[PDB]
Design a binder for this molecule. Structure first.
Ligand code: NAG
Ligand code: NAG
Ligand code: NAG
Ligand code: NAG
Ligand code: NAG
Ligand code: NAG
Ligand code: NAG
Ligand code: NAG
Ligand code: NAG
Ligand code: NAG
Ligand code: NAG
Ligand code: NAG
Ligand code: NAG
Ligand code: NAG
Ligand code: NAG
Ligand code: NAG
Ligand code: NAG
Ligand code: NAG
Ligand code: NAG
Ligand code: NAG
Ligand code: NAG
Ligand code: NAG
Ligand code: NAG
Ligand code: NAG
Ligand code: NAG
Ligand code: NAG
Ligand code: NAG
Ligand code: NAG
Ligand code: NAG
Ligand code: NAG
Ligand code: NRH
Ligand code: NRH
Ligand code: NRH
Ligand code: NRH
Ligand code: NRH
Lengths: 292, 292, 292, 292, 292
């Protein structure tokens, strides 16, 4: 059976002439094909004001090393070892479109290496990644966030992202967003290889949200009613003033929470702007009638 | 008696052929059984809006090293030494479901090693760990937060979490949450070993909270009274308007503080939505009667 | 006179067989007695909502090393040297009850060593330390915050906190809190040595605070006056509504700022809750009289 | 074809007598001309209250090394290698006018070196850079933000910024700001070389913004109307009070969001101050007429 | 002319027997006189609530090394070299009264050394430094902030701060604060040398501020007018209630923004407290007259 001394001998011979900074290819003219595996774990939040999405992923990177190989029968059937991540060449993949707010560094850890040269380098990653969030169809709104991977400095004739396999682990259920992160895409070659996973996010219709909407609907009905009220009823000016006040309160409230960076504005927000304008027109009619 | 030179000799012989990256087993076919001890210290806060719980734990890790052994009679009865945490193999346990906001790194410290090979590696850990917080039964609400431990990259045929012993140290009393973190659970094997401690949190009924509720109750009584008030009393429209205003003020207030990510909405919030709807219906009746 | 070469020779002989990880005692059966000196510098703030106190201290640690000694007459009267903090054994003292938000690491610096073995290791430390803040007697409120020191992993038969000498440096005057941090306490032995300094904090009565109170007092007088107002005066309902509004505005305001984690609620807050209830009862009487 | 052993030999000979701290020039009397390439990627936000702009750039640095050269025919046509960034001399360029909030250190990475000595050192950089933000012509406002580069400590007779080439990558479209970052500028020599890229930012006129203004315009019309209303209409005092309230609500609202550090105040804010003053004058006229 | 090999030889001989931790003096009885140069660059903000001032300085430190000298004619006229900051002894100067929020560590960089032994160690530093901010004379308020330098652990017989030369670089104009940071001061010897630069800050009177004041003045005039209004006018109670509401709105607003830690409270705040008290007295008179 394999022993501690056997693995020690294997590692000692394995790392004899290894340069961490020289790409791991016998012939330097060939590229190293990296296939990345980005399994989402949890979608913590979707910050509308800052245009970010906070999530934790299980970024995986797989490639082939041609210098790190061995006949396992020559080492008592040792088929795999674990190496410190900072002793071996690692492709310079970065979360190109993201602020990596991770708590561990990307050079402290361990990777799994197989006797054929295949390296697995699973790594956890908490990302604050930029998304262009359009709150147009709120609250029945959808969004598309692209999580980018790209090599840092290597050219496509040196290192390439062969493929990007993105899935969802289903660790937790959200109850606020319906996440749809599935599919395979080849890397895009434009001087530096890079790929992106499209994340589709649909807000789930919660009865808390529908209840929060209900006040808006009944205020619209009430505004219509007071606008239809007889000019000589006597309550015109009073209810027009009080409900213009309340309308402006909700307009300020929503406007301070709606994203300011959208391709189009929020339909609901504009519908409440129209409501406030109609309340103002009702007040105008009331004062005009009162003076005349 | 044991001396400084004796411990120096012991350490020098002990670390002679030790590889930090080779698992500590004579035969590599055997697994290293890690038993984790997670004693809670303080529950700083339960952030509802961010769906996190902030606490400080005394994470402990115990396993057995088969290479680090000695006959203590051969070294003047030295029964235990202290080694720097980064010189010895350490299982790659991570707070899988947590943002480790600790201030010290997880590779700077010290561990206690016993002559039989048993290693104790107590470590402090301040965690911002994700919890699905349902504010349904507020303020008589309960919650279940699972604190996850899982090996980072090792397979179950290499490293396993034998057990998880979680308790509460009682360092401090909360006065806001009743914490119930006690029990033992075996590790779960699904390609990577992992376990979780269930933390049950019950909000303690404080008289500050009951006093905060009292205004809501008296506003409900007052709304019922004004709704029952005679249409021809003369105060109908006035009190309906003013109390619809105040109702909406409390509705906005609570809605901006209630969690938006819940399996069900807050019953109290929906009860105040119903109160606001009834106030609106009272205003509708008042205006209808006033015009007719 | 002592020279650079003399100190170089001294250090070279001093560090010859020193192991940073072996406790500094000739006989390992004896404990190392550490006396800690915690001089407060400034009390930046007392955050009520987060239950923390922010301050900057001059944590000092003194112990005796039995391996690091020399006859000063043998080295041209060199009586003390300065060593890098990470080359020498340092007791593993941690701010057990604190989030060390310091900006320098605890392994980068310098310590003063004397020819008798005595080590001084003064270190600055900015702490966010947990305190159970009870806002009961606000604004004439007092608090007790205990700053904890405890060894990280060493047993009481290896390392002990001999004493804790805590004082105040008086660097700055607060004008908001009266600080009383003075006294000496022996360490407490419960498997791991530890001690704590009690910090008493009394809010200083400022005329800004008394002025902030004045509105509350005059609102109480005014509420009493309107409650005593004749039912048939005609201003009853109007002033009851407007002053219930303003009362609720201040009640919401204070409740959003008062700590939610207190042994008892704030007396002033409950007195304003009673004020709001009395305003509601006045409104109830007014509407009842108006209908009848 | 070039091989791993060939590149190993090349690097071994290349780094034989290289001192990272000695400037890379054969004759020390000559300067190293550094040309910097600052390609903007995304303009995350423009924080008005803090006077900062948050963006992510692709800072590039190019210079010539006279010690790191080779005849590529002597090494099987190896024309370029990749070196770790901390093994080679790197010009001490700093984001002089910026808080570098990047997540990777500036001494961990890789650079591209060519057989003629030319070094490319592309590096990602997320910057919180100070800008003097004048909200005068809001919301048709423009701004000029200068991104500064300057050598840290080297004199102009040692290191110089030859040129600064700044462009925009167009990675993402903003929809909130029109960015115009293009042009070439020579470095400025004043004891320490330095250059700056001028960034012009024009707020794009969105229909969400125009809708947000619409309430202000109709309130101005309504204030004019009520000011023109007959003194004896009977609604003067009522609408003057209610609309002074609402005016002050919007004045407080805008004033709490407008930058306090501007060369001139916001015209729109001052126009609404004038609106509030006119409402106050209307109230003055109403009360004066009512008493007389 | 000097060459790369010449500088390599110089550095190799220079660092032969240099100990980074032994003070750089031939005779250890002499002190090292450090003169510090603190040139301010920008005053980002003055945070009133947290009692801090955020600025970026060009902290410089100059002293004399007696071991690092050379005859420049013996090395082809090399008159100065650049050494890595962590290879040479560096005085342990700390921003004693500040939270150093800098992004680079204080042991990564470079210093300029001259053939006579003189070392220049210019370093950038972004500081969050504590200031006792008294908002008494707001908005015509002044402040004095002292930026402290002190040696960390060395005694005055080992290391001293000879002088502190503080100036302003004028990099940017503030438009909000008039900064006056100029002068020279000797170090203060009280067991540990230390000095401080006094920074005087005067708020510049902006027309945005005067316009923001204008509402307060017109509300004072209006309150005087309504208080003078005839008891039997009929608008007394109405305007007293509405303007007590608005007064309390501004009182709450200012009180939540004024610093709570001041030697004396804000005069303007207390003048508005008096305004609110006068409004309350007017309401008291109105209700008393109405009942009687
Ligand atoms: C490693 O390289 C050295 C040259 O530096 C050579 O002598 C040795 O034979 C090589 N060994 C292997 C296993 O490639
Ligand atoms: C490198 O190129 C040569 C050229 O013939 C080829 O024989 C060799 O197989 C290549 N290396 C590998 C690992 O295939
Ligand atoms: C080596 O180990 C593998 C692991 O499954 C096993 O299938 C194989 O039979 C083993 N071979 C020998 C020669 O031990
Ligand atoms: C790879 O591409 C880069 C730029 O695209 C070029 O400079 C380099 O010479 C190329 N290398 C090879 C081996 O083709
Ligand atoms: C996810 O999106 C893709 C592309 O829009 C679609 O084909 C697929 O059906 C979606 N899946 C779910 C579960 O929504
Ligand atoms: C992606 O790459 C594979 C491998 O060369 C190729 O077969 C396939 O056609 C490419 N395109 C897609 C859409 O998979
Ligand atoms: C340690 O390993 C070496 C081989 O590198 C061997 O010569 C030596 O005897 C070993 N010593 C022990 C104590 O195992
Ligand atoms: C390793 O396996 C062999 C196989 O017989 C066994 O004799 C030996 O005891 C095992 N090692 C240990 C430490 O038990
Ligand atoms: C060794 O130390 C242990 C510690 O309790 C003690 O019980 C034992 O008697 C000692 N044995 C010898 C031989 O000193
Ligand atoms: C352990 O499991 C992994 C995957 O489950 C497998 O690749 C590996 O060969 C296994 N090793 C042994 C010794 O069974
Ligand atoms: C804690 O929870 C468990 C399981 O729900 C229960 O058996 C136990 O009684 C609880 N203990 C306390 C103190 O609530
Ligand atoms: C847990 O593991 C132990 C040890 O093998 C076993 O005896 C026990 O049955 C397992 N299950 C539980 C619930 O303890
Ligand atoms: C230090 O220890 C070594 C053994 O490693 C010994 O040969 C030497 O004499 C010791 N020197 C001193 C000064 O203790
Ligand atoms: C250690 O113990 C022995 C036992 O007699 C004693 O003589 C010696 O003095 C002790 N060491 C010290 C430093 O006192
Ligand atoms: C050694 O230095 C101390 C320092 O005060 C002094 O008192 C003493 O006389 C000196 N002794 C000699 C022999 O120099
Ligand atoms: C010290 O105490 C620990 C636990 O309290 C024990 O394991 C250890 O054996 C003790 N050592 C001595 C020398 O008494
Ligand atoms: C500090 O508190 C202690 C204990 O409560 C008391 O004896 C002492 O007089 C206090 N000192 C001051 C200055 O308040
Ligand atoms: C503290 O320790 C000292 C030293 O042994 C002892 O004299 C004293 O009685 C202890 N207790 C107190 C309260 O000081
Ligand atoms: C490098 O410098 C050494 C002197 O330290 C010299 O002997 C050697 O020849 C030099 N080699 C090269 C390639 O410059
Ligand atoms: C350095 O100066 C000498 C002086 O003549 C000159 O010949 C030489 O070419 C210079 N070095 C380089 C790299 O040009
Ligand atoms: C070296 O490589 C370059 C790369 O394009 C090629 O153009 C040139 O012909 C090659 N020369 C030799 C001799 O291989
Ligand atoms: C370069 O300039 C600095 C200051 O401007 C001066 O001290 C130094 O002597 C100059 N060096 C040369 C080689 O001119
Ligand atoms: C950018 O600004 C420059 C200088 O103001 C101007 O010449 C150029 O036309 C501008 N370009 C765009 C696209 O606005
Ligand atoms: C900038 O530097 C270049 C290179 O010396 C020079 O030709 C040019 O005149 C300078 N000025 C401008 C505006 O480009
Ligand atoms: C440096 O110190 C060593 C002793 O460690 C001595 O032999 C050598 O001569 C010294 N060299 C210089 C230049 O001082
Ligand atoms: C050190 O002191 C001696 C005492 O006479 C003196 O001669 C010498 O000059 C001093 N060192 C220096 C660098 O002045
Ligand atoms: C050395 O360089 C300085 C730099 O200005 C110059 O003034 C001096 O003449 C030079 N001397 C020699 C001998 O080269
Ligand atoms: C320097 O002062 C410290 C304390 O002030 C003292 O302990 C030390 O002995 C003094 N050293 C000399 C050389 O005077
Ligand atoms: C700065 O303050 C000092 C001392 O108060 C004063 O002498 C000097 O005139 C002031 N300068 C300015 C520009 O305010
Ligand atoms: C400061 O130190 C210098 C140098 O000794 C001295 O001349 C001066 O009198 C001291 N005081 C002042 C105010 O400069
Ligand atoms: C490194 C990696 C990627 C890039 C780069 C440098 N410069 C760019 C300019 N435009 C687009 C991408 C890049
Ligand atoms: C390492 C450790 C755990 C995991 C991993 C990589 N990839 C996963 C995918 N799904 C679930 C868990 C994991
Ligand atoms: C190290 C240091 C202190 C402790 C520890 C581990 N475990 C504990 C459990 N309960 C209380 C204190 C501790
Ligand atoms: C280093 C680099 C730049 C500077 C410096 C030190 N001191 C300065 C004083 N004023 C302006 C720039 C500088
Ligand atoms: C180091 C540096 C400065 C100080 C110190 C330790 N202890 C103090 C106590 N009081 C004041 C200053 C200090």
């Amino acid at each position: 059976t394999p022993t501690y001394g056997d693995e020690r001998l294997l590692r000692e011979k394995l790392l004899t002439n290894y340069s961490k900074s020289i790409r791991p290819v016998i012939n330097l003219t060939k590229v190293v094909d990296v296939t990345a595996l980005l399994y989402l774990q949890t979608l913590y939040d979707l910050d509308f004001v800052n245009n970010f999405i906070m999530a934790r992923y299980y970024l995986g990177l797989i490639w082939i090393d041609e210098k790190l190989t061995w006949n396992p029968l020559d080492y008592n059937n040792i088929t795999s070892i674990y190496l410190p991540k900072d002793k071996i060449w690692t492709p310079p993949i970065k979360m190109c479109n993201s602020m990596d707010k991770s708590e561990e560094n990307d050079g402290v850890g361990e990777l799994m290496l197989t006797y054929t040269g295949w390296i697995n380098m699973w790594s956890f990653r908490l990302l604050h990644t930029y998304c262009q969030i359009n709150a147009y169809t709120y609250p029945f709104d959808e969004h598309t966030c692209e999580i980018y991977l790209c090599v840092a400095l290597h050219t496509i004739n040196h290192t390439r992202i062969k493929e990007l396999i993105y899935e969802d682990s289903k660790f937790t259920q959200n109850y606020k967003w319906d996440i749809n992160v599935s599919g395979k895409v080849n890397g895009t070659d434009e001087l530096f290889s890079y790929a992106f996973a499209p994340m589709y996010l649909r807000r789930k219709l919660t009865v808390g949200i529908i209840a929060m909407l209900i006040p808006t609907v009944m205020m619209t009905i009430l505004t219509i009613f007071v606008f239809l009220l007889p000019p000589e009823s006597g309550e015109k000016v009073s209810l027009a003033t009080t409900i213009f006040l309340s309308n402006v309160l909700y307009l300020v409230q929503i406007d301070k929470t709606t994203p300011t960076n959208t391709k189009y504005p929020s339909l609901l927000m504009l519908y409440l702007m129209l409501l406030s304008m109609l309340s103002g027109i009702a007040t105008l009619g009331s004062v005009v009638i009162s003076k005349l």
